[PDB]
Nucleic acid binder design. Structure first.
Ligand SMILES: Nc1nc2c(ncn2[C@@H]2O[C@H](COP(=O)(O)OP(=O)(O)OP(=O)(O)O)[C@@H](O)[C@H]2O)c(=O)[nH]1
Ligand SMILES: [Mg+2]
Lengths: 1000, 326
DNA sequence: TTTATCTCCAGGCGGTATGCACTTT
DNA sequence: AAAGTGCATACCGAACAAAGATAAA
């Protein structure tokens, strides 16, 4: 069955008591709960086991005997854990051999195995050593055999990656070993501090008397708040302990896990980092709970002593990546980490959701109650009355209402006037300064000390992790190796581009290119009310945009002269995203413009041509002509490129007219240097070259269905010119609009030259995924409301027209595609009726489950400001959402296939010594190597679709969901619908190896 | 379903109630959803100047037959009173209409707020949309926009029993006292001009004219005494402190004060303003332990004006437009 | 007659008054 | 004999803001 909320909170209390090392409290609570008949039923075996282990670690035998008497009296039979704890304590106390003989003889009478004791998950290495010493008394020798390291994966797709009989050319960095070790020390200290301070990049404020007065007042308020928070924390601790001594549950051990100073510092950081509009109570609560769990994991590691083990293993591991050092046998970084001997990192038990929300709420209430401020800041001592800093206000949306903490209006003005020149970032949000830890298991990886989860999910979900941990160990090797390869790409920031961006941003901003503008340059009876409303709104959006830009630019300027790495993880489907949110290459055009590779490569014979093709692709003017025409066009506009590179702001300004600004500039800056060099074939390029794929989902449908016309339509066959379905759909829509406009309808006249590929691209893409007309209307409206050359008053009448015509253009565009989509949709629905969520396995081997469940019926926490309502993700007892599982089956499957293709390509590029990074379907590299990647890509695609993916999926679905005969009629229906798979066509995938524009 | 007058006795009783005043009977009565035209024909027999606002086109020619011979007394305009001045923007479709266009086609000029009532709208509230219609009317009235832009136009509408009871709740606390009652009794003078059993009104569904014993069965299910309620906007609604710019803060204050019904005024005031709550409650005259439910609408308006009249503190409210749309 | 509307990059209403069970004064 | 403690459901606000197209519900 499943545990109740109190049965979770009590277990969490007992487990936390072991870490906090207050066993008397746990013993008292257990005795009180066992004594009363009503609370006796709540206690389970694990609650006795936790206290028994805690007592055994100390070395008290009387208490362990008493708890064993309690558990034998209450009910149930002792399990292996109780006997393991008994042996551990008996060995601790140097018990006589006769007692050990008797205990183990009884244990054999029940009938178990001593090996399972040393394979117990809970027991650590020290506990295992102690119990081994204890058992060595009765048996003079006891041993557990070692084994060969985990076998390499044996599958059709991944065989070549893990085969030793071959030639390997694994790359290496460009840095000395000592520099790498120093960077490791810097990153370790940074993570231990848990904060970084960055010098603000905004325009400095000239000193004045008012600024100094504001700073002094701020300092005084900070000191007063610190003292008040310390006193409040002490009082709360005492009050919560008194409840424990009354035989009631509380959060005393949870609040005793960290020092008072650290909690106070975290609370002041949260107060200093509060937006002027405030935040909802539930959001502030999840944030405070999460920050406390991270600080406890880092501090536990520091106190125990794993920090030193990581330092030694890492410093020895850094020999593989450094250029100077050499490895006896080259291998994948995960393989070397395992072979070098792996320190054991024990997973941290996640707190239950109710406890997390309760702790967050308690901390937020303490923060709001403890801080107070004088009412009159400008006028000192006018009134001795003290006003709260934060206020609890309701905000009403439709019937519903929300609670919000809002700062006092004078505090915001004081902060604005003070203009502190230092921003504070959390260590998790900043890019690392040392190479990432190799992903060796789902539990450990990415950051040095902070906890990072493999599959990013909601704060309480656990089904994905248990599915990951229940699979064979060798299945996830490919995914882990791909993640490690992606995270091991050194980065750097461009200098002159950053200087130009700073010049534009600091002075006035250039909203045309993308740089926001300062609030100073802002626009300025019913009519007056409307004008003020518009002004306030516009000021709000511009302020938010400038705040985000300020954060990103400050972070970028901090790393001006450093090398940094970006770790990656994945979602539940399988697509990979970088971990640092603020600054990465997945962001806007400026983000893609500032970043560049750190390890350059010579251009070679075929580097300049690919650079020119990349420049033309970024420009966007020529996207239908072949490669020769793009190269010729790049040749034609050489003067404009050189002028833009030499004079970016004072000149002909050709680059600003590109579709992708700030990247055309960088590419021109590189191309001019390459051209002006004495030998352009011996020039080092640090600039990645993008490589995109057209109609990727349509490509995967074409591959699975093997439909000849569909394959030919999406560049999946050899051709001389690119093929685009979107352009054909746009042409058909334009023909229909021309006929309608000649007939006389006004909206046809309104939108005449605004039917481009952009407006219909997303809709045509998402039709095959089963999008409805409402979503298509919203997409077309969103596209239309940004042209700025279209009369907006027709938008509702425009999109509502276009969608229909667009859907018209699709009676019979796809047949096998829609057959496959309908089959998947019907299978998902029929599975969803029986109450079982749909699951599948990707060709790489990772398992995917789609967690859509009906809402929990009530979930509130009682309290002294408001009753927080929170969803209970983490209840497997709820019923599945048939509507959201039906709609999401195709897109998740195709995204998983895309991720598999990307991972295979990345691994086979790493084997040849390539710097491969990717964004979903865009494959970056150095300029010289692009052609090589192209080849392997096609190969992988063919292999990825050489296996019968659809047949394997059908058989797996039949095995998993039709084995149970519980509903015989519906089981027969599901068997019938799953045993009918659409037949393939007549298409030989070898032609993919020769097609030029499959990726272009 | 839509309710249309069915009998001539009703057609004359309602007409007499509408045009009861014998001194200056001339008003350009605006009648909405005429339906068959029985009420309009009765009003013409009594003598008036009707600007009919039918929603459906099918009835439009039919009314044209009744008033074809009459020259200027009756004007049929295809419009809906409850869709005037859409806030979405764009082109105004024929089913909707803009207030300026209507008051230009009718020739009505602009009348100051303190002056006499220019017009008189009559009709029935939506069958299932009383709350939304009342809230839209409240926003239009408190902001001097749309109809109430031109003046303090009287509105006389048929409403149900439950919404009327919720609209006429007092500090006597029948546990129906809420913000809608406060604003509507602060901005109007609600009176029960007449009462009618609901079965006395013909019911036409969107599908067609309702018939069959189901109509008789429906009669027992929804039997409630419909009230014809008269609303005139109050002359002294707007003051120095209460202006069309500051109505949002008053609305937020009233909504917040009813978030916790069983709470005192001082707690909400602490949650809403940085001012000394005890001093304010001393100025307004009420006691410290004053419940929100035991406050009159005039007390709420006086409290809001007293807070807004505080010169000493530069910052008065924590209300901000960022608190909306979230 | 009533409601949600392709997927992902991690989201949720807060108050009042009612019974029902059992433990505690 | 009364009274406290804690958990389950149910009905309140239906804050306005035009409109149309499809099927699970
Ligand atoms: N379901 C869904 N998938 C999307 C959406 N946007 C992008 N994708 C997926 O992302 C893939 C590639 O994204 P894009 O590069 O933007 O699309 P594309 O078809 O490659 O575009 P072109 O390069 O112009 O051909 C698509 O094939 C889809 O699988 C979306 O809104 N919904
Ligand atoms: Mg693409």
């Amino acid at each position: 069955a499943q545990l109740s909320g109190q049965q979770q909170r009590l277990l969490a209390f007992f487990k936390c008591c072991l870490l906090t090392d207050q066993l008397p409290l746990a013993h008292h609570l257990l005795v009180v709960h066992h004594g009363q008949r009503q609370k006796r039923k709540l206690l389970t075996l694990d609650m006795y086991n936790a206290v028994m282990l805690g007592w055994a670690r100390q070395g008290a035998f009387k208490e362990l005997v008493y708890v064993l008497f309690m558990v034998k009296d209450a009910g149930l039979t002792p399990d292996l854990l109780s006997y393991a704890a008994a042996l551990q304590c008996m060995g601790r106390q140097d018990q006589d051999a006769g007692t050990i003989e008797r205990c183990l003889e009884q244990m054999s009478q029940e009938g178990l195995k001593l090996q399972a004791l040393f394979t117990a998950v809970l027991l650590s290495e020290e506990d295992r050593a102690t119990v081994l010493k204890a058992v060595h008394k009765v048996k003079p020798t006891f041993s557990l055999p070692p084994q060969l390291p985990p076998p390499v994966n044996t599958s059709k797709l991944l065989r070549d990656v893990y085969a030793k009989d071959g030639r390997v050319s694994y790359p290496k960095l460009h840095l000395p070993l000592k520099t790498l070790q120093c960077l490791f020390e810097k990153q370790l200290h940074m993570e231990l501090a848990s904060r970084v301070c960055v010098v603000s990049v905004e325009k400095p404020t000239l000193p004045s008397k008012e600024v100094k007065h504001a700073r002094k007042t701020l300092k005084t308020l900070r000191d007063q708040w610190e003292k008040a928070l310390c006193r409040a924390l002490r009082e709360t601790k005492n009050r919560l302990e008194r409840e424990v001594y009354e035989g009631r549950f509380s959060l005393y051990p949870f609040l005793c896990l960290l020092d008072e100073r650290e909690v106070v510092r975290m609370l002041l950081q949260v107060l200093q980092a509060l937006p002027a509009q405030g935040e909802s109570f539930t959001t502030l609560a999840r944030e405070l709970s999460a920050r406390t769990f991270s600080r406890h994991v880092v501090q536990r590691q520091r106190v125990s002593g794993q920090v030193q083990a990581l330092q030694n293993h890492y410093r020895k591991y850094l020999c593989l990546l450094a250029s100077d050092a050499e490895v006896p046998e080259p291998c994948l970084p995960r393989q070397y980490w395992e072979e070098l001997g792996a320190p054991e990192a024990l997973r941290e038990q996640p707190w239950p959701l109710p406890v997390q929300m309760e702790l967050g709420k308690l901390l937020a209430e303490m923060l709001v109650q403890a801080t107070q401020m004088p009412c009159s800041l400008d006028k000192p001592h006018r009134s001795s009355r003290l006003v709260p800093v934060l206020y609890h206000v309701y905000s009403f949306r439709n019937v519903q209402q929300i609670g919000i903490l809002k700062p006092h209006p004078a505090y915001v003005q004081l902060l604005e006037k003070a203009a502190e020149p230092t921003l504070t970032f959390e260590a998790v949000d900043v890019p690392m300064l040392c190479p990432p830890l190799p992903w060796t298991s789902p539990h450990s990886g990415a950051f040095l000390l902070s906890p990072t989860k493999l599959m990013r999910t909601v704060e309480g979900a656990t089904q994905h992790q248990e599915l990951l941990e229940t699979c064979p160990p060798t299945a996830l090797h490919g995914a882990l190796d791909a993640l490690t390869q992606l995270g091991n790409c050194a980065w750097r920031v461009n200098g002159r581009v950053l200087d130009l961006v700073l010049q534009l941003f600091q002075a006035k901003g250039c909203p045309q290119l993308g740089v926001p503008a300062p609030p100073s340059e802002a626009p300025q009876k019913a009519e007056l009310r409307r004008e003020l409303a518009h002004c306030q709104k516009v000021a709000r959006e511009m302020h938010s945009l400038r705040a985000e830009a300020l954060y990103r630019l400050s972070l970028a300027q901090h790393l001006r002269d450093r090398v940094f790495w970006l770790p990656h993880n994945m979602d539940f489907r399988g697509r990979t995203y970088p971990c640092p949110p603020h600054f990465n290459h997945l962001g806007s055009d400026v983000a893609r413009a500032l970043l560049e590779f750190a390890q350059g490569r010579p251009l070679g014979p075929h580097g300049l041509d690919w650079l020119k093709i990349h420049l033309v692709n970024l420009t966007g003017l020529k996207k239908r002509e072949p490669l020769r025409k793009r190269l010729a066009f790049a040749e034609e506009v050489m003067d404009d490129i050189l002028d833009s590179a030499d004079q970016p702001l004072t000149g002909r300004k050709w680059w600003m007219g590109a579709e992708e600004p700030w990247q055309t500039l960088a590419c021109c800056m590189e191309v001019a240097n390459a051209v002006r060099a004495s030998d352009p074939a011996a020039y080092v390029s640090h600039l990645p070259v993008h490589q995109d794929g057209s109609c990727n989902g349509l490509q995967h449908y074409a591959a699975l269905g093997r439909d000849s016309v569909g394959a030919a339509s999406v560049n999946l066959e050899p051709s001389d010119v690119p093929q685009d379905v979107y352009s054909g759909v746009a042409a058909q829509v334009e023909v229909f609009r021309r006929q309608d406009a000649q007939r006389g309808m006004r909206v046809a006249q309104v939108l005449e030259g605004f039917i481009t590929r952009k407006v219909v691209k997303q809709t045509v893409m998402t039709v095959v995924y089963g999008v409805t007309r409402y979503g298509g209307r919203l997409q077309i409206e969103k596209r239309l409301r940004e042209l700025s050359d279209f009369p907006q008053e027709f938008v509702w009448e425009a999109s509502h027209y276009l969608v229909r015509q667009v859907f018209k253009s699709l009676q019979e565009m796809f047949s096998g595609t829609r057959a496959i989509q309908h089959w998947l949709t019907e299978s998902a629905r029929l599975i969803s009726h029986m109450g079982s969520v749909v699951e599948w396995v990707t060709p790489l081997g990772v398992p995917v489950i789609q967690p859509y469940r009906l809402d929990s019926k009530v979930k509130q926490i009682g309290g002294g400001i408001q009753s927080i309502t929170y969803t209970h993700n983490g209840d497997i007892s709820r019923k599945p959402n048939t509507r959201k599982q039906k709609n999401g089956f195709p897109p998740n499957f195709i995204h998983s296939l895309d991720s598999s293709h990307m991972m295979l390509t990345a691994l086979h590029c790493y084997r040849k010594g390539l710097t491969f990074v990717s964004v979903h379907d865009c494959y970056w590299t150095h300029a010289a190597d692009v052609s090589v990647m192209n080849q392997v890509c096609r190969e992988q695609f063919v292999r990825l679709h050489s296996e019968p993916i659809l047949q394997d999926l059908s058989r797996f679905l039949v095995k998993r969901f039709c084995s149970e005969p519980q509903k015989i009629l519906e089981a027969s229906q599901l068997k019938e619908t799953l045993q009918a798979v659409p037949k393939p066509g007549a298409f030989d995938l070898e032609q993919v190896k020769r097609s030029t524009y499959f990726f272009s | 379903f839509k309710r249309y007058v069915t009998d001539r006795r009703l057609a004359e009783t309602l007409a007499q109630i509408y045009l009861g005043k014998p001194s200056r009977p001339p008003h350009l009565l605006l009648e909405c959803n005429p339906g068959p035209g029985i009420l309009t024909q009765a009003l013409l027999e009594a003598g008036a100047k009707v600007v009919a606002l039918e929603s459906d086109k099918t009835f439009i020619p039919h009314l044209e037959s009744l008033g074809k011979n009459l020259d200027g007394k009756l004007r049929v305009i295809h419009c809906d009173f409850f869709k005037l001045d859409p806030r979405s923007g764009g082109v105004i479709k024929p089913p909707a209409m803009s207030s300026r266009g209507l008051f230009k086609n009718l020739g009505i000029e602009a009348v100051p707020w303190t002056a006499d009532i220019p017009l008189k709208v009559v009709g029935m509230f939506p069958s299932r949309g009383e709350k939304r219609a009342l809230w839209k009317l409240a926003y239009d009235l408190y902001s001097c926009t749309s109809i109430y832009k031109f003046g303090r136009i009287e509105v006389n509408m048929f409403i149900g029993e439950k919404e009327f009871q919720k609209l006429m709740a007092d500090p006597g606390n029948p546990d129906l006292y809420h913000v809608l009652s406060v604003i509507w009794q602060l901005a109007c003078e609600i009176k029960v001009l007449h009462m009618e059993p609901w079965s006395s009104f013909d019911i036409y569904t969107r599908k067609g004219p309702l018939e069959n014993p189901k109509r008789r069965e429906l009669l027992d299910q929804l039997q409630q005494k419909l009230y014809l309620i008269q609303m005139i906007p109050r002359q002294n609604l707007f003051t120095k402190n209460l202006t069309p710019m500051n109505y949002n803060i008053f609305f937020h204050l009233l909504k917040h004060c009813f978030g916790r019904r069983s709470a005192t005024v001082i707690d909400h005031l602490r949650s809403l303003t940085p001012l000394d709550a005890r001093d304010i409650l001393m100025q307004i005259g009420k006691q410290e332990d004053e419940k929100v439910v035991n406050m009159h609408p005039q007390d709420f308006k006086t409290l809001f004006e007293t807070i807004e009249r505080s010169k000493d503190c530069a910052y008065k409210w924590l209300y901000d437009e960022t608190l909306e749309d979230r």
